[PDB]
Amino acid sequence: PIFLNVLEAIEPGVVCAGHDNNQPDSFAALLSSLNELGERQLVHVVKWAKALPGFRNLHVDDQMAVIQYSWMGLMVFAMGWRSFTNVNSRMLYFAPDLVFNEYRMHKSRMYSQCVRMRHLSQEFGWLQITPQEFLCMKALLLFSIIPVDGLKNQKFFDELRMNYIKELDRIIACSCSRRFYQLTKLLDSVQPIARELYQLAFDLLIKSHMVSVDFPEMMAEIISVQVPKILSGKVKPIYFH
Numbered sequence: 001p002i003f004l005n006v007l008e009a010i011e012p013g014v015v016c017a018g019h020d021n022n023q024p025d026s027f028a029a030l031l032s033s034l035n036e037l038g039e040r041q042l043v044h045v046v047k048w049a050k051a052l053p054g055f056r057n058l059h060v061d062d063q064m065a066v067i068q069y070s071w072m073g074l075m076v077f078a079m080g081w082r083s084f085t086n087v088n089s090r091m092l093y094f095a096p097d098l099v100f101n102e103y104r105m106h107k108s109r110m111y112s113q114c115v116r117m118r119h120l121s122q123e124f125g126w127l128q129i130t131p132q133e134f135l136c137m138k139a140l141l142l143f144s145i146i147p148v149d150g151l152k153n154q155k156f157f158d159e160l161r162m163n164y165i166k167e168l169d170r171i172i173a174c175s176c177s178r179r180f181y182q183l184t185k186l187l188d189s190v191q192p193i194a195r196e197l198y199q200l201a202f203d204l205l206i207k208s209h210m211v212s213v214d215f216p217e218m219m220a221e222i223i224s225v226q227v228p229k230i231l232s233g234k235v236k237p238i239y240f241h
């Protein structure tokens with residue numbers, strides 16, 4: 001169980017958004033706290049990724065690129081699990097101090113995306129996803145979006161991605177065929193959700209100075225430098241099906 005030992009050991013702990021819950025639920029306050037949460041979680045995503053088995057086998061530029069393309073999907077998948085285990089999926093548990101009810105879903109102007117995120121959360125229940133399955137699936141999400149022109153050493157990436165697929169297969173194996181199909185269909189469903197959120201993030205950054213929404217340093221950098229490569233089709237998800 002070496003692989004699962006590692007995934008459990010490096011899983012990030014609780015991250016708070018810093019949200020002042022006694023101010024009114026305005027669009028600007030809610031989106032500014034979500035952006036701050038993203039900035040805080042990005043720190044943990046980087047430290048988590050660098051500690052994954054085999055990750056340092058990747059070229060150093062590929063390491064940062066893969067994090068900078070997959071972070072939305074990783075963060076939404078993890079938030080979906082938090083929601084399933086904490087509020088049982090009619091609310092979104094972005095953080096202990098940033099829990100979206102239906103009112104916040106509307107005031108954030110993200111209601112339809114939150115609905116889809118809620119559906120993703122509920123699938124952990126409908127499919128009875130185990131903690132071990134969640135951990136392996138989340139790791140695989142780091143290796144599920146790349147440039148169409150390929151990475152700087154694509155061969156090492158393809159080997160590492162293969163090995164994470166094998167680990168998922170082992171965790172299921174420890175019926176199997178139906179399970180693997182279910183989990184890979186679930187993984188595929190993350191990318192379209194992440195794409196819609198990437199679109200929202202980009203549009204909000206462009207008009208941020210006018211809706212009074214503050215973007216932290218690394219969020220502003222990644223949404224203006226890397227996210228447009230996804231939105232323009234230069235960086236694309238790897239789907240199973």
Ligand SMILES: C[C@]12CCC(=O)C[C@@H]1CC[C@@H]1[C@@H]2CC[C@]2(C)[C@@H](O)CC[C@@H]12
Nearest residue numbers: 034035037038075076079094197200201
């Ligand atoms: C990743 C975050 C923050 C971390 C998390 O739990 C998931 C959530 C998904 C929506 C993202 C948000 C970060 C800030 C974004 C990108 C806003 O700009 C628009 C959509 C928000």
